[PDB]
Amino acid sequence: TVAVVFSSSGPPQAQFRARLTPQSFLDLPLEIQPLTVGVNTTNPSSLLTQICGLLGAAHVHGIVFEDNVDTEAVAQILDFISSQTHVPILSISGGSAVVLTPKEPGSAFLQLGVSLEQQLQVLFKVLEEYDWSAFAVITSLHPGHALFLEGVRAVADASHVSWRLLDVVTLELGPGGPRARTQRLLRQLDAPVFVAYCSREEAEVLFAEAAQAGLVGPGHVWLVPNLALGSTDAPPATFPVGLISVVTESWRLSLRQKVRDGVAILALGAHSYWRQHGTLPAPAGDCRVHPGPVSPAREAFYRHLLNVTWEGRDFSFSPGGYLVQPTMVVIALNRHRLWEMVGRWEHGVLYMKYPVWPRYSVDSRHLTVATLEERPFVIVESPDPGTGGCVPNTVPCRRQSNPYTKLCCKGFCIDILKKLARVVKFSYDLYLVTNGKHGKRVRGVWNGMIGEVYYKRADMAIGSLTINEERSEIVDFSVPFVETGISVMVAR
Amino acid sequence: ERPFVIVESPDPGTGGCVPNTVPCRRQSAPYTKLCCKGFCIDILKKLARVVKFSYDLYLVTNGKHGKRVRGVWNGMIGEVYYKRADMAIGSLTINEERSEIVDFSVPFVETGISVMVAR
Amino acid sequence: KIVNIGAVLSTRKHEQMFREAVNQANKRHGSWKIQLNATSVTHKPNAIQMALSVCEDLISSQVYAILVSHPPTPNDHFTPTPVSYTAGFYRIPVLGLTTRMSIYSDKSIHLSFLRTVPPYSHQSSVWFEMMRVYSWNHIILLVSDDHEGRAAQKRLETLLEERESKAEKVLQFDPGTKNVTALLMEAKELEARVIILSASEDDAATVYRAAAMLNMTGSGYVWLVGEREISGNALRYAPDGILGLQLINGKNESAHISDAVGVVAQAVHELLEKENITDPPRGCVGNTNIWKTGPLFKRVLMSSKYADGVTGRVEFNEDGDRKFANYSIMNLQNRKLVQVGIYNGTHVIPNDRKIIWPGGETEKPRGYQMSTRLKIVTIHQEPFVYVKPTLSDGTCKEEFTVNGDPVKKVICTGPNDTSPGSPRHTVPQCCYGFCIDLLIKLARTMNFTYEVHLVADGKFGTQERVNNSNKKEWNGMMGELLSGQADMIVAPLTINNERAQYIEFSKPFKYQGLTILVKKRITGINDPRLRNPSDKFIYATVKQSSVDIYFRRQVELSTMYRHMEKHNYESAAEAIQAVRDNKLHAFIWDSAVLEFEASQKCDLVTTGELFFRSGFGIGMRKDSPWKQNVSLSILKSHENGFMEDLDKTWVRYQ
């Protein structure tokens, strides 16, 4: 027996029209026994009485829950009730999709969500793909703040990379009035990569304060776990374009999608243990008698609900009540103010749809740098053997065709520019040219690096480029640093 | 002592003295600041940045390096063993007689007993 | 503006006491601007109906703070769960008069909660204080698998890492189990001699009886436990001499009432004036929303500095801890308890008469049972360690030296008779050298007993992130030292930063550096032939050495590693033949042995001077008891010309 319940929604006729008749998902190896209950705006007393009365009257063998505006502590009521009455319940929806690390020794909650550890793993893989290599953490002491501060270290410290972490900052804000010192504290910082952790309204006030402070430019990138930005179906205001957040497979999700998932998985789990010397289970007693002090052999049936598979998507579980080895995607906000697919982690290594970050939008950063590989000065080399992030003491460079293959460049001017950027606090990317080596004013049109700088397609030029009257007419120059000349090479 | 440490009077023209030097008091009401720079002084400076702590420098008055007379200890070792000071830096040697009453760290300047004569 | 609060209780007599206490505490102020009130209910068996009763209490009055206690029922962990969960939906503050369980300390699952009695974690801190009293630094942490166990282990780990000396082989056993003898027998080998336990009462009795069967409660040793390990029926299995401690005035909680209302009084008259308080959440049905000022009230109450309750000055911590509660130390003085110490936060006062340890000795017993037969590991090195095959009579050549004095030799086991390829041949060889004489002197001075054996890897050992990615475990000899295969290391071993974390070194006894070897000439590290490697000249070193790390951590010199990693003999003095084979020209290695090679052999020349300074030294495991003495001994030898005489005898006449 399987039952469905929802706490709040829009037009409720659709759920009853698409879930009542026992023909929904009639493909699983079990004749599902469905029955419906419901409830208006949720309160602890109303929820408790309604659901355990439904259990005591209909004696169903499992329930699935659908959620609402995503309150903060409903899951506590849920697993308390589950432990008290000893029935394996399941929930897949917005606010209930939060993990609870300390479980009770007798509860069967079994949510569908991922812990912050794997989220940080995926996010750090995302960062290593782009290889920004310099991050700082800014956390507000929201609920469960210490777990994030532990997990960031536990993940970043052990990998075959450097991860030159900048610093950690802790914030507290009551946004209405007490945010005075927070302004200066947020002004003080300096880092190229930011990773945040807070709630949605707290995110809105924090980003407003950041915009007031000024550390929002495109030369900085924000990273936020799935705890915030819950309202995917609605792009909120005062949010900066081009941040990265990571969510599980939920683009196909809806009311009907969750309905089709839940009952099917529960029935298949009910039948899998029967497949080898099993019998159909029976419900628990009631919410009144407080029975069942011991854990019978039927608890293994709950243990039988660990391994599961359907529809190609792996729903492999974990001993704590969550799923392990999951399929999940990484998202971002484009210029149209709407969530768009950016990448995913399909059990292997990261994928991509935009191979370069478009930094879309005057006293800005990330200036364009165009160069050419002269023999001793700027040296271009093929990437690392298998990784992609080239050997240290090198800078990634990208030759364009306007196959943007990633090469690694190192040399004299490379280190010069690295020191210069480290001393004047600017960010850069290395771009090569295709139209000629240096370029001349043939037919009154400028090609090469000089032409690229002239046409404002590249803000700077570095490398083997001499000085003379011809080029100095239209392009500025700096103080020379290598005394060159014109000489004659001959034999001995 | 030897150029391992250098003591100088503060520059009277400019009031104090030049940077790259650490103020030091020769306490024996007797405060009259001098300023000290050298080898071990630079080690302690550079050294202070990395652990992270804050300190002062007072010179030694009674005794040079510390020897037991009638069962008492003076000098550097006395000033450290009577809990009047924490560490003794400069030109201090390691042997069996000293290391039984005071802790010692790793060595960074090797030396021994040497003989000098005319040319 | 009648401010109303409530408090649920257990015995219905403490309810009348609470009513009297609150109406008496109302006499603090009566200015008619603010008034107080109370409402009390009693407990019930069923959890769900009890929570529904809490909701009825919630609707019946726009409450401000609920208070909870424990009934005489023995159902401990099932007592306070429902009220916190239900009242947390509206950020209603809840005050737990008495509940010591660890889980409630987390403000992320019970986000609204405040406690007056500290959880079981904090008492661990007391142990640390006691641990500093009598200078004990090697521990055996025994703990269960429950959440309280993990909390205690974490708390002790951070408190140890404050001073950051060490922990020693923590081991956890499953809860509610029998025959725990396996773990105790496994851990009985270690040199530590003090244990710490904190688990269930029945588990305490089980471990007590198991240790009695294994004979661990005897003399010399000492192990102390937490609070509930000396209660219930655990006394029926406990031996004399085990330390114990409890809280000064717990389990009464009636006086605790006299505190709680106090602080909440000290809260209410300080909150009603902030800006816009005006309401608590009224109702218990339909009103799906939270209190607009709940966090503000909770935060203001948390930082309250109360003056004087019954149980001294009471404050709160960042999460709601007791903030300097009291503790009394009792001894199992012949199946009874005697209050021997008072812990109030900074120390424990030994104001009592006498403390009896499990051994019956009335003096302070130290741990660290000193072993007598060590497990010495060594390595083949030309001028320091000589290894030879034995004569089948039972030893090797027993004969005089140039001076006529007998050269002392030992018998060391070790290798597989062939380093590159062989299954194994663990055979005894005869074993004599400079370091062997130094070890003989050390053993004569400190009454030792040695069993020398060589390494199987044939290499010193560096950090290696193996293809199975994990923490880079130490290689070969160092892994043998750390894993417990060996106990002390005597060899020409360098002293570097990368090794100082896990090992304790003695004072260096021979200063030495790095030098080049060629067979003639050459120069130091300045020539373009080394700045830009040439196809003619080949520069190679010994693989898995400290020089590998040295060349693996230099920014500018990185490219030389690119050459060095290309071809370097993963070898030993055998690679010396490379310079004899005219294949490898330059050999960069340590100064002493390579210089002795020049004197002993011929046509081999050393060029220039050194370019690095280090030293050899005896190493041991982290904070071993011997260190000081051993170091002192070495220094004393260096005073008596012993080192100079050994230098002369072994490497002078050549």
Ligand SMILES: *[C@@H]1O[C@H](CO)[C@@H](O[C@@H]2O[C@H](CO)[C@@H](O[C@@H]3O[C@H](CO)[C@@H](O)[C@H](O)[C@@H]3O)[C@H](O)[C@H]2NC(C)=O)[C@H](O)[C@H]1NC(C)=O
């Ligand atoms: C993973 O999920 C699968 C999906 O149902 C479950 O299968 C388990 O597989 C074990 C493997 O042997 C089976 O155990 C049974 O043991 C009895 C002992 O007499 C034997 O007669 C049976 O032929 C069978 O081998 C069984 O199918 C099932 N385990 C149990 C306890 O029923 C299971 O839920 C998960 N796998 C494991 C190992 O828990």
Ligand SMILES: *[C@@H]1O[C@H](CO)[C@@H](O[C@@H]2O[C@H](CO)[C@@H](O)[C@H](O)[C@H]2NC(C)=O)[C@H](O)[C@H]1NC(C)=O
């Ligand atoms: C619980 O604590 C209260 C207060 O500490 C105890 O009441 C005190 O008892 C002593 C000795 O009888 C009296 O001198 C005090 O005047 C009492 N104080 C009050 C406020 O009544 C009480 O006895 C304790 N109960 C238990 C069972 O330990």
Ligand SMILES: *[C@@H]1O[C@H](CO)[C@@H](O[C@@H]2O[C@H](CO)[C@@H](O)[C@H](O)[C@H]2NC(C)=O)[C@H](O)[C@H]1NC(C)=O
């Ligand atoms: C807690 O008890 C200890 C020991 O009984 C007290 O420690 C004394 O505090 C004074 C300062 O008041 C200091 O001189 C020493 O730390 C202790 N005196 C001695 C050892 O003679 C402490 O004051 C008590 N109260 C606390 C820590 O609040």
Ligand SMILES: *[C@@H]1O[C@H](CO)[C@@H](O[C@@H]2O[C@H](CO)[C@@H](O)[C@H](O)[C@H]2NC(C)=O)[C@H](O)[C@H]1NC(C)=O
């Ligand atoms: C370190 O050396 C000291 C002194 O050599 C040792 O202390 C001696 O211990 C023996 C037996 O325990 C006593 O008979 C001596 O009287 C002690 N010496 C003194 C001066 O009291 C100490 O045991 C050694 N420790 C280690 C770990 O080897």
Ligand SMILES: *[C@@H]1O[C@H](CO)[C@@H](O)[C@H](O)[C@H]1NC(C)=O
């Ligand atoms: C005060 O408490 C009594 C206790 O029963 C209750 O009847 C009354 O309604 C309460 N009044 C207010 C204003 O809280």
Ligand SMILES: *[C@@H]1O[C@H](CO)[C@@H](O)[C@H](O)[C@H]1NC(C)=O
């Ligand atoms: C179980 O207990 C017996 C007691 O006779 C003991 O000999 C045996 O080693 C124990 N087994 C384990 C695995 O501890």
